[PDB]
PDB file of all heavy atoms in Angstrom:
ATOM      1  N   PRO A  72      14.471 -13.464  -0.565  1.00 24.45           N
ATOM      2  CA  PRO A  72      15.679 -13.418   0.305  1.00 24.45           C
ATOM      3  C   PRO A  72      16.711 -14.450  -0.111  1.00 24.45           C
ATOM      4  O   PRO A  72      16.321 -15.457  -0.737  1.00 24.45           O
ATOM      5  CB  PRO A  72      15.130 -13.830   1.705  1.00 24.45           C
ATOM      6  CG  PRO A  72      13.651 -13.424   1.637  1.00 24.45           C
ATOM      7  CD  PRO A  72      13.258 -13.669   0.170  1.00 24.45           C
ATOM      8  N   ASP A  73      17.960 -14.220   0.318  1.00 20.53           N
ATOM      9  CA  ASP A  73      19.128 -15.128  -0.085  1.00 20.53           C
ATOM     10  C   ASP A  73      18.762 -16.591   0.185  1.00 20.53           C
ATOM     11  O   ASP A  73      19.006 -17.435  -0.655  1.00 20.53           O
ATOM     12  CB  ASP A  73      20.420 -14.811   0.704  1.00 20.53           C
ATOM     13  CG  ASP A  73      21.021 -13.448   0.403  1.00 20.53           C
ATOM     14  OD1 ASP A  73      20.874 -12.925  -0.709  1.00 20.53           O
ATOM     15  OD2 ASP A  73      21.656 -12.920   1.345  1.00 20.53           O
ATOM     16  N   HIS A  74      18.171 -16.894   1.333  1.00 20.52           N
ATOM     17  CA  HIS A  74      17.872 -18.239   1.743  1.00 20.52           C
ATOM     18  C   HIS A  74      16.820 -18.882   0.842  1.00 20.52           C
ATOM     19  O   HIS A  74      16.701 -20.122   0.861  1.00 20.52           O
ATOM     20  CB  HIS A  74      17.545 -18.321   3.230  1.00 20.52           C
ATOM     21  CG  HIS A  74      16.127 -18.013   3.681  1.00 20.52           C
ATOM     22  ND1 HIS A  74      15.784 -16.749   4.143  1.00 20.52           N
ATOM     23  CD2 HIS A  74      15.088 -18.795   3.787  1.00 20.52           C
ATOM     24  CE1 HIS A  74      14.515 -16.745   4.469  1.00 20.52           C
ATOM     25  NE2 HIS A  74      14.053 -17.999   4.271  1.00 20.52           N
ATOM     26  N   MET A  75      16.080 -18.060   0.065  1.00 21.61           N
ATOM     27  CA  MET A  75      14.937 -18.544  -0.655  1.00 21.61           C
ATOM     28  C   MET A  75      15.112 -18.474  -2.186  1.00 21.61           C
ATOM     29  O   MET A  75      14.250 -18.748  -2.951  1.00 21.61           O
ATOM     30  CB  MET A  75      13.585 -17.824  -0.380  1.00 21.61           C
ATOM     31  CG  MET A  75      13.083 -18.108   1.012  1.00 21.61           C
ATOM     32  SD  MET A  75      11.447 -17.431   1.347  1.00 21.61           S
ATOM     33  CE  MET A  75      10.403 -18.538   0.335  1.00 21.61           C
ATOM     34  N   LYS A  76      16.369 -18.152  -2.604  1.00 22.13           N
ATOM     35  CA  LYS A  76      16.650 -17.884  -3.996  1.00 22.13           C
ATOM     36  C   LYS A  76      16.480 -19.120  -4.872  1.00 22.13           C
ATOM     37  O   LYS A  76      16.288 -19.005  -6.110  1.00 22.13           O
ATOM     38  CB  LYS A  76      18.008 -17.210  -4.174  1.00 22.13           C
ATOM     39  CG  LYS A  76      18.101 -15.778  -3.612  1.00 22.13           C
ATOM     40  CD  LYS A  76      18.859 -14.812  -4.424  1.00 22.13           C
ATOM     41  CE  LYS A  76      19.026 -13.507  -3.743  1.00 22.13           C
ATOM     42  NZ  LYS A  76      17.814 -12.645  -3.829  1.00 22.13           N
ATOM     43  N   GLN A  77      16.489 -20.290  -4.267  1.00 20.06           N
ATOM     44  CA  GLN A  77      16.350 -21.521  -5.047  1.00 20.06           C
ATOM     45  C   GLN A  77      14.919 -21.811  -5.362  1.00 20.06           C
ATOM     46  O   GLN A  77      14.617 -22.713  -6.109  1.00 20.06           O
ATOM     47  CB  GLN A  77      17.029 -22.661  -4.283  1.00 20.06           C
ATOM     48  CG  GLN A  77      16.170 -23.196  -3.113  1.00 20.06           C
ATOM     49  CD  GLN A  77      16.686 -22.665  -1.802  1.00 20.06           C
ATOM     50  OE1 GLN A  77      17.050 -21.530  -1.685  1.00 20.06           O
ATOM     51  NE2 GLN A  77      16.696 -23.567  -0.801  1.00 20.06           N
ATOM     52  N   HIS A  78      13.985 -20.962  -4.860  1.00 21.28           N
ATOM     53  CA  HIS A  78      12.587 -21.146  -5.099  1.00 21.28           C
ATOM     54  C   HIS A  78      12.022 -20.044  -5.989  1.00 21.28           C
ATOM     55  O   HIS A  78      10.812 -19.969  -6.090  1.00 21.28           O
ATOM     56  CB  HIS A  78      11.839 -21.068  -3.742  1.00 21.28           C
ATOM     57  CG  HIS A  78      12.406 -22.029  -2.773  1.00 21.28           C
ATOM     58  ND1 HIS A  78      12.297 -23.362  -2.881  1.00 21.28           N
ATOM     59  CD2 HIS A  78      13.141 -21.819  -1.610  1.00 21.28           C
ATOM     60  CE1 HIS A  78      12.920 -23.945  -1.858  1.00 21.28           C
ATOM     61  NE2 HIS A  78      13.408 -23.003  -1.104  1.00 21.28           N
ATOM     62  N   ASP A  79      12.854 -19.306  -6.703  1.00 23.11           N
ATOM     63  CA  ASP A  79      12.367 -18.216  -7.599  1.00 23.11           C
ATOM     64  C   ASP A  79      12.143 -18.719  -9.050  1.00 23.11           C
ATOM     65  O   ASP A  79      13.048 -18.550  -9.844  1.00 23.11           O
ATOM     66  CB  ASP A  79      13.239 -16.996  -7.498  1.00 23.11           C
ATOM     67  CG  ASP A  79      12.730 -15.750  -8.152  1.00 23.11           C
ATOM     68  OD1 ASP A  79      11.706 -15.823  -8.787  1.00 23.11           O
ATOM     69  OD2 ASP A  79      13.314 -14.689  -8.010  1.00 23.11           O
ATOM     70  N   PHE A  80      11.024 -19.323  -9.311  1.00 19.74           N
ATOM     71  CA  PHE A  80      10.630 -19.795 -10.619  1.00 19.74           C
ATOM     72  C   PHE A  80      10.714 -18.631 -11.637  1.00 19.74           C
ATOM     73  O   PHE A  80      11.272 -18.746 -12.785  1.00 19.74           O
ATOM     74  CB  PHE A  80       9.227 -20.396 -10.577  1.00 19.74           C
ATOM     75  CG  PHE A  80       8.681 -20.545 -11.965  1.00 19.74           C
ATOM     76  CD1 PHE A  80       8.898 -21.652 -12.712  1.00 19.74           C
ATOM     77  CD2 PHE A  80       7.908 -19.555 -12.560  1.00 19.74           C
ATOM     78  CE1 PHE A  80       8.510 -21.754 -14.041  1.00 19.74           C
ATOM     79  CE2 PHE A  80       7.486 -19.616 -13.857  1.00 19.74           C
ATOM     80  CZ  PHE A  80       7.764 -20.741 -14.584  1.00 19.74           C
ATOM     81  N   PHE A  81      10.115 -17.545 -11.252  1.00 21.94           N
ATOM     82  CA  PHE A  81       9.881 -16.310 -12.142  1.00 21.94           C
ATOM     83  C   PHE A  81      11.148 -15.858 -12.759  1.00 21.94           C
ATOM     84  O   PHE A  81      11.229 -15.795 -13.937  1.00 21.94           O
ATOM     85  CB  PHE A  81       9.253 -15.170 -11.310  1.00 21.94           C
ATOM     86  CG  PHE A  81       7.979 -15.591 -10.580  1.00 21.94           C
ATOM     87  CD1 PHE A  81       8.016 -15.861  -9.252  1.00 21.94           C
ATOM     88  CD2 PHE A  81       6.776 -15.695 -11.260  1.00 21.94           C
ATOM     89  CE1 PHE A  81       6.821 -16.179  -8.573  1.00 21.94           C
ATOM     90  CE2 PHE A  81       5.597 -16.069 -10.616  1.00 21.94           C
ATOM     91  CZ  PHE A  81       5.653 -16.230  -9.243  1.00 21.94           C
ATOM     92  N   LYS A  82      12.219 -15.602 -11.885  1.00 21.43           N
ATOM     93  CA  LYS A  82      13.478 -15.095 -12.463  1.00 21.43           C
ATOM     94  C   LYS A  82      14.171 -16.187 -13.260  1.00 21.43           C
ATOM     95  O   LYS A  82      14.918 -15.849 -14.199  1.00 21.43           O
ATOM     96  CB  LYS A  82      14.359 -14.500 -11.326  1.00 21.43           C
ATOM     97  CG  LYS A  82      13.881 -13.147 -10.792  1.00 21.43           C
ATOM     98  CD  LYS A  82      14.878 -12.538  -9.805  1.00 21.43           C
ATOM     99  CE  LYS A  82      14.246 -11.506  -8.857  1.00 21.43           C
ATOM    100  NZ  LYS A  82      13.066 -12.026  -8.191  1.00 21.43           N
ATOM    101  N   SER A  83      14.073 -17.414 -12.861  1.00 16.86           N
ATOM    102  CA  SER A  83      14.826 -18.516 -13.455  1.00 16.86           C
ATOM    103  C   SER A  83      14.400 -18.798 -14.892  1.00 16.86           C
ATOM    104  O   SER A  83      15.148 -19.415 -15.707  1.00 16.86           O
ATOM    105  CB  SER A  83      14.795 -19.807 -12.630  1.00 16.86           C
ATOM    106  OG  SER A  83      13.572 -20.548 -12.852  1.00 16.86           O
ATOM    107  N   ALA A  84      13.159 -18.455 -15.285  1.00 16.98           N
ATOM    108  CA  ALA A  84      12.666 -18.665 -16.635  1.00 16.98           C
ATOM    109  C   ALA A  84      13.095 -17.573 -17.611  1.00 16.98           C
ATOM    110  O   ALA A  84      12.784 -17.637 -18.782  1.00 16.98           O
ATOM    111  CB  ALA A  84      11.121 -18.768 -16.614  1.00 16.98           C
ATOM    112  N   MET A  85      13.829 -16.550 -17.105  1.00 16.09           N
ATOM    113  CA  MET A  85      14.166 -15.409 -17.934  1.00 16.09           C
ATOM    114  C   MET A  85      15.549 -15.706 -18.552  1.00 16.09           C
ATOM    115  O   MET A  85      16.396 -16.335 -17.904  1.00 16.09           O
ATOM    116  CB  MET A  85      14.301 -14.152 -17.091  1.00 16.09           C
ATOM    117  CG  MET A  85      12.952 -13.691 -16.612  1.00 16.09           C
ATOM    118  SD  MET A  85      11.827 -13.120 -17.935  1.00 16.09           S
ATOM    119  CE  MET A  85      10.285 -13.133 -17.058  1.00 16.09           C
ATOM    120  N   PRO A  86      15.815 -15.155 -19.749  1.00 16.20           N
ATOM    121  CA  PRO A  86      15.042 -14.048 -20.337  1.00 16.20           C
ATOM    122  C   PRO A  86      13.925 -14.487 -21.359  1.00 16.20           C
ATOM    123  O   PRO A  86      13.193 -13.625 -21.854  1.00 16.20           O
ATOM    124  CB  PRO A  86      16.054 -13.163 -21.063  1.00 16.20           C
ATOM    125  CG  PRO A  86      17.092 -14.229 -21.529  1.00 16.20           C
ATOM    126  CD  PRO A  86      17.057 -15.290 -20.492  1.00 16.20           C
TER     127      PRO A  86
END
Side-chain angles (χ1 to χ4, degrees):
Chain A
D73 294 329
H74 84 262
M75 287 190 73
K76 291 220 185 284
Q77 75 258 43
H78 308 291
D79 191 354
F80 164 87
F81 306 102
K82 287 188 202 50
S83 82
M85 291 293 164

